[PDB]
Design a protein around this nucleic acid. Structure first.
Ligand SMILES: [Mg+2]
Ligand SMILES: [Mg+2]
Ligand SMILES: [Mg+2]
Ligand SMILES: [Mg+2]
Ligand SMILES: [Mg+2]
Ligand SMILES: [Mg+2]
Ligand SMILES: [Mg+2]
Ligand SMILES: [Mg+2]
Ligand SMILES: [Mg+2]
Ligand SMILES: [Mg+2]
Ligand SMILES: [Mg+2]
Ligand SMILES: [Mg+2]
Ligand SMILES: [Mg+2]
Ligand SMILES: [Mg+2]
Ligand SMILES: [Mg+2]
Ligand SMILES: [Mg+2]
Ligand SMILES: [Mg+2]
Ligand SMILES: [Mg+2]
Ligand SMILES: [Mg+2]
Ligand SMILES: [Mg+2]
Ligand SMILES: [Mg+2]
Ligand SMILES: [Mg+2]
Ligand SMILES: [Mg+2]
Ligand SMILES: [Mg+2]
Ligand SMILES: [Mg+2]
Ligand SMILES: [Mg+2]
Ligand SMILES: [Mg+2]
Ligand SMILES: [Mg+2]
Ligand SMILES: [Mg+2]
Ligand SMILES: [Mg+2]
Ligand SMILES: [Mg+2]
Ligand SMILES: [Mg+2]
Ligand SMILES: [Mg+2]
Ligand SMILES: [Mg+2]
Ligand SMILES: [Mg+2]
Ligand SMILES: [Mg+2]
Ligand SMILES: [Mg+2]
Ligand SMILES: [Mg+2]
Ligand SMILES: [Mg+2]
Ligand SMILES: [Mg+2]
Ligand SMILES: [Mg+2]
Ligand SMILES: [Mg+2]
Ligand SMILES: [Mg+2]
Ligand SMILES: [Mg+2]
Ligand SMILES: [Mg+2]
Ligand SMILES: [Mg+2]
Ligand SMILES: [Mg+2]
Ligand SMILES: [Mg+2]
Ligand SMILES: [Mg+2]
Ligand SMILES: [Mg+2]
Ligand SMILES: [Mg+2]
Ligand SMILES: [Mg+2]
Ligand SMILES: [Mg+2]
Ligand SMILES: [Mg+2]
Ligand SMILES: [Mg+2]
Ligand SMILES: [Mg+2]
Ligand SMILES: [Mg+2]
Ligand SMILES: [Mg+2]
Ligand SMILES: [Mg+2]
Ligand SMILES: [Mg+2]
Ligand SMILES: [Mg+2]
Ligand SMILES: [Mg+2]
Ligand SMILES: [Mg+2]
Ligand SMILES: [Mg+2]
Ligand SMILES: [Mg+2]
Ligand SMILES: [Mg+2]
Ligand SMILES: [Mg+2]
Ligand SMILES: [Mg+2]
Ligand SMILES: [Mg+2]
Ligand SMILES: [Mg+2]
Ligand SMILES: [Mg+2]
Ligand SMILES: [Mg+2]
Ligand SMILES: [Mg+2]
Ligand SMILES: [Mg+2]
Ligand SMILES: [Mg+2]
Ligand SMILES: [Mg+2]
Ligand SMILES: [Mg+2]
Ligand SMILES: [Mg+2]
Ligand SMILES: [Mg+2]
Ligand SMILES: [Mg+2]
Ligand SMILES: [Mg+2]
Ligand SMILES: [Mg+2]
Ligand SMILES: [Mg+2]
Ligand SMILES: [Mg+2]
Ligand SMILES: [Mg+2]
Ligand SMILES: [Mg+2]
Ligand SMILES: [Mg+2]
Ligand SMILES: [Mg+2]
Ligand SMILES: [Mg+2]
Ligand SMILES: [Mg+2]
Ligand SMILES: [Mg+2]
Ligand SMILES: [Mg+2]
Ligand SMILES: [Mg+2]
Ligand SMILES: [Mg+2]
Ligand SMILES: [Mg+2]
Ligand SMILES: [Mg+2]
Ligand SMILES: [Mg+2]
Ligand SMILES: [Mg+2]
Ligand SMILES: [Mg+2]
Ligand SMILES: [Mg+2]
Ligand SMILES: [Mg+2]
Ligand SMILES: [Mg+2]
Ligand SMILES: [Mg+2]
Ligand SMILES: [Mg+2]
Ligand SMILES: [Mg+2]
Ligand SMILES: [Mg+2]
Ligand SMILES: [Mg+2]
Ligand SMILES: [Mg+2]
Ligand SMILES: [Mg+2]
Ligand SMILES: [Mg+2]
Ligand SMILES: [Mg+2]
Ligand SMILES: [Mg+2]
Ligand SMILES: [Mg+2]
Ligand SMILES: [Mg+2]
Ligand SMILES: [Mg+2]
Ligand SMILES: [Mg+2]
Ligand SMILES: [Mg+2]
Ligand SMILES: [Mg+2]
Ligand SMILES: [Mg+2]
Ligand SMILES: [Mg+2]
Ligand SMILES: [Mg+2]
Ligand SMILES: [Mg+2]
Ligand SMILES: [Mg+2]
Ligand SMILES: [Mg+2]
Ligand SMILES: [Mg+2]
Ligand SMILES: [Mg+2]
Ligand SMILES: [Mg+2]
Ligand SMILES: [Mg+2]
Ligand SMILES: [Mg+2]
Ligand SMILES: [Mg+2]
Ligand SMILES: [Mg+2]
Ligand SMILES: [Mg+2]
Ligand SMILES: [Mg+2]
Ligand SMILES: [Mg+2]
Ligand SMILES: [Mg+2]
Ligand SMILES: [Mg+2]
Ligand SMILES: [Mg+2]
Ligand SMILES: [Mg+2]
Ligand SMILES: [Mg+2]
Ligand SMILES: [Mg+2]
Ligand SMILES: [Mg+2]
Ligand SMILES: [Mg+2]
Ligand SMILES: [Mg+2]
Ligand SMILES: [Mg+2]
Ligand SMILES: [Mg+2]
Ligand SMILES: [Mg+2]
Ligand SMILES: [Mg+2]
Ligand SMILES: [Mg+2]
Ligand SMILES: [Mg+2]
Ligand SMILES: [Mg+2]
Ligand SMILES: [Mg+2]
Ligand SMILES: [Mg+2]
Ligand SMILES: [Mg+2]
Ligand SMILES: [Mg+2]
Ligand SMILES: [Mg+2]
Ligand SMILES: [Mg+2]
Ligand SMILES: [Mg+2]
Ligand SMILES: [Mg+2]
Ligand SMILES: [Mg+2]
Ligand SMILES: [Mg+2]
Ligand SMILES: [Mg+2]
Ligand SMILES: [Mg+2]
Ligand SMILES: [Mg+2]
Ligand SMILES: [Mg+2]
Ligand SMILES: [Mg+2]
Ligand SMILES: [Mg+2]
Ligand SMILES: [Mg+2]
Ligand SMILES: [Mg+2]
Ligand SMILES: [Mg+2]
Ligand SMILES: [Mg+2]
Ligand SMILES: [Mg+2]
Ligand SMILES: [Mg+2]
Ligand SMILES: [Mg+2]
Ligand SMILES: [Mg+2]
Ligand SMILES: [Mg+2]
Ligand SMILES: [Mg+2]
Ligand SMILES: [Mg+2]
Ligand SMILES: [Mg+2]
Ligand SMILES: [Mg+2]
Ligand SMILES: [Mg+2]
Ligand SMILES: [Mg+2]
Ligand SMILES: [Mg+2]
Ligand SMILES: [Mg+2]
Ligand SMILES: [Mg+2]
Ligand SMILES: [Mg+2]
Ligand SMILES: [Mg+2]
Ligand SMILES: [Mg+2]
Ligand SMILES: [Mg+2]
Ligand SMILES: [Mg+2]
Ligand SMILES: [Mg+2]
Ligand SMILES: [Mg+2]
Ligand SMILES: [Mg+2]
Ligand SMILES: [Mg+2]
Ligand SMILES: [Mg+2]
Ligand SMILES: [Mg+2]
Ligand SMILES: [Mg+2]
Ligand SMILES: [Mg+2]
Ligand SMILES: [Mg+2]
Ligand SMILES: [Mg+2]
Ligand SMILES: [Mg+2]
Ligand SMILES: [Mg+2]
Ligand SMILES: [Mg+2]
Ligand SMILES: [Mg+2]
Ligand SMILES: [Mg+2]
Ligand SMILES: [Mg+2]
Ligand SMILES: [Mg+2]
Ligand SMILES: [Mg+2]
Ligand SMILES: [Mg+2]
Ligand SMILES: [Mg+2]
Ligand SMILES: [Mg+2]
Ligand SMILES: [Mg+2]
Ligand SMILES: [Mg+2]
Ligand SMILES: [Mg+2]
Ligand SMILES: [Mg+2]
Ligand SMILES: [Mg+2]
Ligand SMILES: [Mg+2]
Ligand SMILES: [Mg+2]
Ligand SMILES: [Mg+2]
Ligand SMILES: [Mg+2]
Ligand SMILES: [Mg+2]
Ligand SMILES: [Mg+2]
Ligand SMILES: [Mg+2]
Ligand SMILES: [Mg+2]
Ligand SMILES: [Mg+2]
Ligand SMILES: [Mg+2]
Ligand SMILES: [Mg+2]
Ligand SMILES: [Mg+2]
Ligand SMILES: [Mg+2]
Ligand SMILES: [Mg+2]
Ligand SMILES: [Mg+2]
Ligand SMILES: [Mg+2]
Ligand SMILES: [Mg+2]
Ligand SMILES: [Mg+2]
Ligand SMILES: [Mg+2]
Ligand SMILES: [Mg+2]
Ligand SMILES: [Mg+2]
Ligand SMILES: [Mg+2]
Ligand SMILES: [Mg+2]
Ligand SMILES: [Mg+2]
Ligand SMILES: [Mg+2]
Ligand SMILES: [Mg+2]
Ligand SMILES: [Mg+2]
Ligand SMILES: [Mg+2]
Ligand SMILES: [Mg+2]
Ligand SMILES: [Mg+2]
Ligand SMILES: [Mg+2]
Ligand SMILES: [Mg+2]
Ligand SMILES: [Mg+2]
Ligand SMILES: [Mg+2]
Ligand SMILES: [Mg+2]
Ligand SMILES: [Mg+2]
Ligand SMILES: [Mg+2]
Ligand SMILES: [Mg+2]
Ligand SMILES: [Mg+2]
Ligand SMILES: [Mg+2]
Ligand SMILES: [Mg+2]
Ligand SMILES: [Mg+2]
Ligand SMILES: [Mg+2]
Ligand SMILES: [Mg+2]
Ligand SMILES: [Mg+2]
Ligand SMILES: [Mg+2]
Ligand SMILES: [Mg+2]
Ligand SMILES: [Mg+2]
Ligand SMILES: [Mg+2]
Ligand SMILES: [Mg+2]
Ligand SMILES: [Mg+2]
Ligand SMILES: [Mg+2]
Ligand SMILES: [Mg+2]
Ligand SMILES: [Mg+2]
Ligand SMILES: [Mg+2]
Ligand SMILES: [Mg+2]
Ligand SMILES: [Mg+2]
Ligand SMILES: [Mg+2]
Ligand SMILES: [Mg+2]
Ligand SMILES: [Mg+2]
Ligand SMILES: [Mg+2]
Ligand SMILES: [Mg+2]
Ligand SMILES: [Mg+2]
Ligand SMILES: [Mg+2]
Ligand SMILES: [Mg+2]
Ligand SMILES: [Mg+2]
Ligand SMILES: [Zn+2]
Lengths: 204, 118, 59, 122, 131, 7
RNA sequence: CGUGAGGGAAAGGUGAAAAGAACCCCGGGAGGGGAGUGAAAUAGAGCCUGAAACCGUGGGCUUACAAGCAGUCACGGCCCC
RNA sequence: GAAUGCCGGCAUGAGUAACGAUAAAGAGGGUGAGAAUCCCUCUCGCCGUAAGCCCAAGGGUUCCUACGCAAUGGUCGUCAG
RNA sequence: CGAUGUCGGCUCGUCGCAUCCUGGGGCUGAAGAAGGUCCCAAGGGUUGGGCUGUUCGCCCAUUAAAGCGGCACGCGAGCUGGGUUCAGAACGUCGUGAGACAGUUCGGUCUCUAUCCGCCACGGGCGCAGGAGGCUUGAGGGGGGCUCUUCCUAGUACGAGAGGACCGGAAGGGACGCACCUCUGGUUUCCCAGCUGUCCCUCCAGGGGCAUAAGCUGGGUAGCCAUGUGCGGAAGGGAUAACCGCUGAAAGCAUCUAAGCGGGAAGCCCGCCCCAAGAUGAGGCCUCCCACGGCAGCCGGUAAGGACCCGGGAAGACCACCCGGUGGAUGGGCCGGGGGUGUAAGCGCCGCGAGGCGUUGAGCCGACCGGUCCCAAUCGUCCGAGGUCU
């Protein structure tokens, strides 16, 4: 169980065996090891990784001390990969080989306050035939006096996206260690520039 | 959503917003400094900077392009003869926007000055 | 629609509970380094017309 | 992208010239047929004394579509019409000629006889 | 980081420079590698370029021809490795970048609208005169 | 209008 | 109010006496603070008395794990006499 | 203490809906205690078988000028029917 | 009855199981395949049309299947209004008549503002014994849960033949779900061009307004998108249901049971994805500040830190969140590139002229990828611990 912190660059397609393969390009490494959660100290196993250097004259004293105890320069981000104990002190793209399958976690693009048709694929109303100001409305939200209420988890309008999403079992199309590049076939959550996490797959 | 869209709307339709920019342009280039609302000011910088830059180039094409917006030959001649030579060695930033301390009384509007630079 | 309407008059307690979020915040003000007057930051001093060390505006 | 109500030209010499899809024969509830899919259709226009007449409920296989179809090599192909060839329950064409080009996808779907009778496979 | 460069750096392994320049309105032959049953052959497709949509490595172009009574539009990736070669058959001169309107023209209506581009014909005849 | 015609 | 026939309101009280507040102050004014009058000025003209709903300011006790026709019975804590 | 009672006063809903044609505004100067809203200038937009002009009904000083801004004006007001 | 709106549809679900399909079984007048019947099973699924206001039903074409019922015949402060259910009119019929008919026919006003509960989202407050900045554990919730076809096994087992498997293996679909924009396909209110009428600048040339809130037309980046792309349902472990056992008395035999032990479902628990310590039972780890000054308290100055303000943001209704604030590339400008448009103006030449040709893939040029301190994030202000009791 291995992971790395990353950055979604953008999409393209490459050509492999006379097939066009859409890819998302991710800048993964290098991720220095900042803290090691152990069963003795913390109750579980995990590495705290770091990612992207930060202006040392921009990192407050509580974080300065934390980096110091590891002997690492200030990084912009800390994230834990759970159940990962890499041998070295720096995780790079070369933990992945082409052909391996990975799960990728990013923050979806935010639709803001979203209607029931965009958020939940509701059917809306008719656009003619007498329909009266309900073309995008959800219709009924319940029954009558029994139960006289609205279910919890009811699908309604509200904020949509800008949430944690994991897409699973993406094929690794290439590793370019000279540039810390990881090509993964298909779509990855979030905008270009967004932070993402690449873990070995959990599908068998 | 508005993801990566450039340009304020200023609650004007397409032709009203262009004329607003053109009129502000004429006024600023006429007096060298104007007061508007902060949002209008900030939008004015780009519009006027582009006309000043074309006036730095100073060819007939530039003059005719600027006239599409400014319309007033006397004012363009001023822009080409008096305004633009001030900026021959300045690479952008031909205008500055400074925010004013006090809001308009009738609608609380925050005001700013927009001026051509030295 | 069928003209929704308040079922009960709001109590003095509930009306004022609703207004627990209405207090004004005081203006953010800083001393002007030229004339020492209190003015909003990042605005031209309305008292001596200075900003960024130099005089910009007649006051 | 053929569905019920879609009209299709008939790219064969069965006698039918226009047919109207009434079913996409691809599972319980497929929305659309593309090239290589079989539909059920009624014959809306025939020429006199051909094999099939107006009013017949026939099977056909879509051979051309106006919606472009995408291919693994990253390319696509689009035709000016929607056209099908009428078959029996053995994928075999009920006429003896195929008119106009047909998509190469038919070969992979086992409509070989149609591929050979076609004047061009694109 | 420069995200644009990193993508261009990914695509660089697949960018082609062997193919000739052409424009909408040019009549072009795309010798294209095709698979069929067991063997893979070369199938020429020749027609009018009606569209070039540009996105660097991701640019594609659309070629239109009439085959046995039916119009056929074929979209190609300009940097595909299945394109063996592209031969300019004829230079035509369009007044616009997208030629969708020729879908609605008779054959002589098209010949009148995309007249031969004598200027670029001469540019092509002048070139090839190498030694 | 008037009333719902419960007739 | 109604074309019209016709319908048809609300609205009383400074003080014994105007002695109805010169003049100064803040304010464009309104209004107020002083001065002055008066036995009395929360009798100052928006004037006798000035209830209640209703609104506000200050203080005592109390309240952010809690289930309520809002009280009552009991005990404890704090504040006051 | 109740009569969907009567007259009046004051609450709630609520700082909520709305502020009355989507023809449209911008800036400079002036006046003033105060100016998006008044005056002047330039730019812009709208009507133009009218959103221009002249009669008749009806209305009855709304006209012109000076001085005003408590209220009236759906905001403001130095402007105004 | 000082009103509990009444059919059907649409939308949106949710539940029961007497189960339509999918999974597991027993019996069979079960050879195989296919069925019949009963048992277990509600996880998921349960199509598109023709007719009728219809519910229902019949029909068409499919399907694994086209289930049955409850939720005020679920859902009109969510929509419809065909029907029914006022006032008009007419037919049949009844009545001398006025009129009458769950008989028919054509028509016929369905009310901007949500106070409380509930629901979807998002904050503010205080709390979690010192106060902070980070990183987390996961109690407990939620999402998901479908299925078909072909091929191999094997034309084998079975069967006179027709036909045709179990088990095990492989490939490819349909619908659904989540995310995404490289491709395909949309949009792209001013990014480019072309065009008419009119008025104007400045006469020509060149332009500007208006013709919509783009005058019209041909195109169109980024973004947002599906028709496009990737990925998901699992696998696996555990405990079971019906059912099938092993061993085994009571009852010398027998018995799945009384002691004990196996096997066994798309279902149950865990596993996957998401939320989550207001989990007041307020958890854990890493780091930072620290015993300041005056009568569990007290009020002042600080600390680590935080907020205010400002430049912004694929974050966003406000709020929040995230990035930056001159030791700076945050926005604006400028420059380079991408991209769109498709060869500007001016001049030169050809034509009588409309035009044409050349300069020239020119000119213009939103958002995209970068660079550059030219312009603006100046200057600062305010909160903020001294840690209760055995
Ligand atoms: Mg490869
Ligand atoms: Mg952070
Ligand atoms: Mg993240
Ligand atoms: Mg996001
Ligand atoms: Mg998206
Ligand atoms: Mg909606
Ligand atoms: Mg959606
Ligand atoms: Mg949708
Ligand atoms: Mg959605
Ligand atoms: Mg719909
Ligand atoms: Mg629908
Ligand atoms: Mg719709
Ligand atoms: Mg509509
Ligand atoms: Mg209606
Ligand atoms: Mg209506
Ligand atoms: Mg409505
Ligand atoms: Mg409508
Ligand atoms: Mg609704
Ligand atoms: Mg009800
Ligand atoms: Mg109801
Ligand atoms: Mg209930
Ligand atoms: Mg959010
Ligand atoms: Mg797979
Ligand atoms: Mg790199
Ligand atoms: Mg992301
Ligand atoms: Mg939206
Ligand atoms: Mg958004
Ligand atoms: Mg929008
Ligand atoms: Mg931007
Ligand atoms: Mg614009
Ligand atoms: Mg608006
Ligand atoms: Mg508006
Ligand atoms: Mg407006
Ligand atoms: Mg507004
Ligand atoms: Mg217009
Ligand atoms: Mg101004
Ligand atoms: Mg303004
Ligand atoms: Mg010149
Ligand atoms: Mg321009
Ligand atoms: Mg400022
Ligand atoms: Mg301000
Ligand atoms: Mg004012
Ligand atoms: Mg006002
Ligand atoms: Mg209603
Ligand atoms: Mg309604
Ligand atoms: Mg309505
Ligand atoms: Mg209402
Ligand atoms: Mg009530
Ligand atoms: Mg109320
Ligand atoms: Mg009350
Ligand atoms: Mg009270
Ligand atoms: Mg109160
Ligand atoms: Mg309240
Ligand atoms: Mg409020
Ligand atoms: Mg306050
Ligand atoms: Mg044909
Ligand atoms: Mg034919
Ligand atoms: Mg016939
Ligand atoms: Mg017929
Ligand atoms: Mg046939
Ligand atoms: Mg052939
Ligand atoms: Mg890119
Ligand atoms: Mg042709
Ligand atoms: Mg021509
Ligand atoms: Mg030429
Ligand atoms: Mg009257
Ligand atoms: Mg009357
Ligand atoms: Mg009268
Ligand atoms: Mg009367
Ligand atoms: Mg009276
Ligand atoms: Mg009195
Ligand atoms: Mg008296
Ligand atoms: Mg007396
Ligand atoms: Mg005096
Ligand atoms: Mg005085
Ligand atoms: Mg004074
Ligand atoms: Mg004074
Ligand atoms: Mg005055
Ligand atoms: Mg006074
Ligand atoms: Mg006073
Ligand atoms: Mg006084
Ligand atoms: Mg006295
Ligand atoms: Mg007094
Ligand atoms: Mg008294
Ligand atoms: Mg008294
Ligand atoms: Mg008395
Ligand atoms: Mg009194
Ligand atoms: Mg009183
Ligand atoms: Mg009193
Ligand atoms: Mg009182
Ligand atoms: Mg008070
Ligand atoms: Mg109080
Ligand atoms: Mg108090
Ligand atoms: Mg509790
Ligand atoms: Mg408590
Ligand atoms: Mg309680
Ligand atoms: Mg309590
Ligand atoms: Mg009581
Ligand atoms: Mg009690
Ligand atoms: Mg007791
Ligand atoms: Mg009584
Ligand atoms: Mg009443
Ligand atoms: Mg009464
Ligand atoms: Mg009463
Ligand atoms: Mg009354
Ligand atoms: Mg009354
Ligand atoms: Mg009274
Ligand atoms: Mg009253
Ligand atoms: Mg009353
Ligand atoms: Mg009142
Ligand atoms: Mg009250
Ligand atoms: Mg009130
Ligand atoms: Mg109120
Ligand atoms: Mg408000
Ligand atoms: Mg409200
Ligand atoms: Mg509101
Ligand atoms: Mg209202
Ligand atoms: Mg109104
Ligand atoms: Mg409003
Ligand atoms: Mg209008
Ligand atoms: Mg208006
Ligand atoms: Mg309109
Ligand atoms: Mg008009
Ligand atoms: Mg202006
Ligand atoms: Mg203005
Ligand atoms: Mg003005
Ligand atoms: Mg001046
Ligand atoms: Mg004003
Ligand atoms: Mg004023
Ligand atoms: Mg002004
Ligand atoms: Mg106005
Ligand atoms: Mg004026
Ligand atoms: Mg001007
Ligand atoms: Mg005229
Ligand atoms: Mg009058
Ligand atoms: Mg008068
Ligand atoms: Mg007034
Ligand atoms: Mg006034
Ligand atoms: Mg006033
Ligand atoms: Mg007065
Ligand atoms: Mg008024
Ligand atoms: Mg007023
Ligand atoms: Mg009014
Ligand atoms: Mg005045
Ligand atoms: Mg007048
Ligand atoms: Mg009733
Ligand atoms: Mg009532
Ligand atoms: Mg009632
Ligand atoms: Mg009622
Ligand atoms: Mg009611
Ligand atoms: Mg519908
Ligand atoms: Mg149901
Ligand atoms: Mg059962
Ligand atoms: Mg079954
Ligand atoms: Mg079964
Ligand atoms: Mg059975
Ligand atoms: Mg048998
Ligand atoms: Mg069998
Ligand atoms: Mg049974
Ligand atoms: Mg089930
Ligand atoms: Mg079911
Ligand atoms: Mg029909
Ligand atoms: Mg129907
Ligand atoms: Mg029916
Ligand atoms: Mg029926
Ligand atoms: Mg069946
Ligand atoms: Mg079956
Ligand atoms: Mg059906
Ligand atoms: Mg039912
Ligand atoms: Mg049902
Ligand atoms: Mg019931
Ligand atoms: Mg019933
Ligand atoms: Mg019914
Ligand atoms: Mg019934
Ligand atoms: Mg119902
Ligand atoms: Mg209902
Ligand atoms: Mg209704
Ligand atoms: Mg209904
Ligand atoms: Mg209801
Ligand atoms: Mg209701
Ligand atoms: Mg209701
Ligand atoms: Mg009706
Ligand atoms: Mg009927
Ligand atoms: Mg009636
Ligand atoms: Mg009769
Ligand atoms: Mg009789
Ligand atoms: Mg009779
Ligand atoms: Mg009747
Ligand atoms: Mg009836
Ligand atoms: Mg009846
Ligand atoms: Mg009957
Ligand atoms: Mg009827
Ligand atoms: Mg009838
Ligand atoms: Mg009817
Ligand atoms: Mg009608
Ligand atoms: Mg009707
Ligand atoms: Mg309404
Ligand atoms: Mg509410
Ligand atoms: Mg509503
Ligand atoms: Mg309630
Ligand atoms: Mg409520
Ligand atoms: Mg609530
Ligand atoms: Mg909170
Ligand atoms: Mg703590
Ligand atoms: Mg923290
Ligand atoms: Mg966790
Ligand atoms: Mg859990
Ligand atoms: Mg809980
Ligand atoms: Mg669960
Ligand atoms: Mg399942
Ligand atoms: Mg075999
Ligand atoms: Mg065998
Ligand atoms: Mg056989
Ligand atoms: Mg199998
Ligand atoms: Mg589902
Ligand atoms: Mg998701
Ligand atoms: Mg989705
Ligand atoms: Mg996307
Ligand atoms: Mg793109
Ligand atoms: Mg696209
Ligand atoms: Mg496209
Ligand atoms: Mg433009
Ligand atoms: Mg024109
Ligand atoms: Mg002139
Ligand atoms: Mg001209
Ligand atoms: Mg020209
Ligand atoms: Mg005009
Ligand atoms: Mg006009
Ligand atoms: Mg139109
Ligand atoms: Mg207009
Ligand atoms: Mg235009
Ligand atoms: Mg367009
Ligand atoms: Mg387009
Ligand atoms: Mg685009
Ligand atoms: Mg694009
Ligand atoms: Mg795009
Ligand atoms: Mg999108
Ligand atoms: Mg799709
Ligand atoms: Mg799938
Ligand atoms: Mg035994
Ligand atoms: Mg025994
Ligand atoms: Mg036992
Ligand atoms: Mg067992
Ligand atoms: Mg087991
Ligand atoms: Mg499964
Ligand atoms: Mg979490
Ligand atoms: Mg906590
Ligand atoms: Mg946590
Ligand atoms: Mg506790
Ligand atoms: Mg507690
Ligand atoms: Mg508990
Ligand atoms: Mg505790
Ligand atoms: Mg904690
Ligand atoms: Mg722990
Ligand atoms: Mg915000
Ligand atoms: Mg913002
Ligand atoms: Mg905001
Ligand atoms: Mg704020
Ligand atoms: Mg924070
Ligand atoms: Mg970040
Ligand atoms: Mg910051
Ligand atoms: Mg900073
Ligand atoms: Mg600073
Ligand atoms: Mg920058
Ligand atoms: Mg940077
Ligand atoms: Mg920049
Ligand atoms: Mg900006
Ligand atoms: Mg370029
Ligand atoms: Mg280009
Ligand atoms: Mg040219
Ligand atoms: Mg030229
Ligand atoms: Mg020319
Ligand atoms: Mg000549
Ligand atoms: Mg030409
Ligand atoms: Mg270019
Ligand atoms: Mg430019
Ligand atoms: Mg630009
Ligand atoms: Mg460029
Ligand atoms: Mg992109
Ligand atoms: Mg530098
Ligand atoms: Mg300062
Ligand atoms: Zn100052």
């Amino acid at each position: 169980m291995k992971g790395i912190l990353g950055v979604k660059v953008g999409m393209t397609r490459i050509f492999r065996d006379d097939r066009a393969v859409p890819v998302t390009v991710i800048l993964a490494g290098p991720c220095p090891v900042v803290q090691r959660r152990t069963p003795e100290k913390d109750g579980y196993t995990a590495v705290q990784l770091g990612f992207l250097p930060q202006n040392p004259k921009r990192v407050n004293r509580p974080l300065k001390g934390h980096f110091a105890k590891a002997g690492v320069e200030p990084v912009r981000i800390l994230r834990e990969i759970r159940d990962f104990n890499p041998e070295g002190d720096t995780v790079t793209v070369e933990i992945f080989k082409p052909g391996e399958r990975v799960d990728v976690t990013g923050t979806s693009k935010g639709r803001g306050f979203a209607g029931v048709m965009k958020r939940w694929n509701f059917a809306g109303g008719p656009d003619s035939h007498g329909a009266h100001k309900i073309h995008r409305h959800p219709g009924s939200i319940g029954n009558r006096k029994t139960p006289g209420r609205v279910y919890k988890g009811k699908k309604m309008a509200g904020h949509y996206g800008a949430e944690r999403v994991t897409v699973m079992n993406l094929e690794v199309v290439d590793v370019i260690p000279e540039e810390n590049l990881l090509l993964v076939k298909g779509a990855v959550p979030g905008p270009n520039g967004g932070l993402v996490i690449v873990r070995e797959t959990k599908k068998a | 959503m508005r993801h990566l869209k450039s340009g304020r709307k200023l609650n004007r339709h397409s032709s009203h917003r262009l004329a607003l920019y053109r009129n502000q342009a004429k006024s600023l280039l006429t007096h060298g400094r104007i007061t508007t609302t902060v949002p209008k000011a900030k939008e004015l910088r780009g519009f006027v900077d582009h006309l000043i830059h074309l006036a730095k180039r100073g060819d007939l094409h530039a003059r005719r392009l600027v006239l599409r917006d400014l319309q007033d030959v006397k004012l363009v001649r001023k822009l080409f003869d008096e305004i633009a030579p001030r900026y021959r060695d300045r690479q952008g930033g031909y205008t500055r926007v400074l925010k004013l301390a006090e809001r308009r009384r009738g609608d609380g509007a925050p005001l700013a000055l927009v001026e051509l630079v030295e | 629609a069928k003209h929704p309407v308040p079922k009960k008059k709001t109590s003095k307690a509930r009306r004022d509970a609703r207004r627990s979020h209405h207090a004004l915040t005081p203006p953010t003000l800083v001393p002007c380094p030229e004339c020492k007057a209190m003015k909003p930051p990042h605005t031209v001093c309305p008292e001596c017309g200075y900003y960024a060390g130099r005089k910009v505006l007649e006051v | 992208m053929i569905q019920p109500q879609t009209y299709l030209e008939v790219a064969d010499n069965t006698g039918a010239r226009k047919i109207m899809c009434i079913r996409v024969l691809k599972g319980s509830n497929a929305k659309y047929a593309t090239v290589g899919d079989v539909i059920v259709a009624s014959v809306k226009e025939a020429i006199p004394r051909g094999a099939v007449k107006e009013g017949d409920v026939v099977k056909a296989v879509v051979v051309r579509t106006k919606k472009e179809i995408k291919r693994p090599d990253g390319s696509a192909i689009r035709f000016d019409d929607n056209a099908a060839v009428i078959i029996n329950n053995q994928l075999e064409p009920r006429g003896t000629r195929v008119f106009g080009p047909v998509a190469r996808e038919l070969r992979e779907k086992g409509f070989m006889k149609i591929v050979s009778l076609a004047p061009e496979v694109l | 980081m420069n995200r644009g460069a990193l993508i261009k750096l990914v695509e660089s392994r697949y960018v082609r420079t062997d193919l000739p320049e052409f424009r909408p309105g040019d009549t072009v032959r795309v010798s294209y590698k095709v698979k069929e049953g067991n063997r893979t052959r070369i199938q020429d497709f020749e027609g009018i370029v009606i569209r070039i949509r540009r996105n660097g490595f991701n640019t594609t172009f659309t070629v239109r021809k009439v085959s046995y009574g039916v119009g056929v539009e074929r979209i190609f990736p300009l940097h595909s490795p299945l394109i063996q070669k592209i031969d300019i058959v004829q230079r035509g001169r369009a007044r616009r970048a997208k030629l969708y309107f020729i879908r609605n023209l008779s054959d002589r209506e098209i010949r009148r609208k995309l007249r031969a581009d004598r200027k670029r014909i001469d540019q092509d005849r002048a070139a090839e005169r190498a030694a | 209008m008037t009333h719902s015609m419960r007739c």
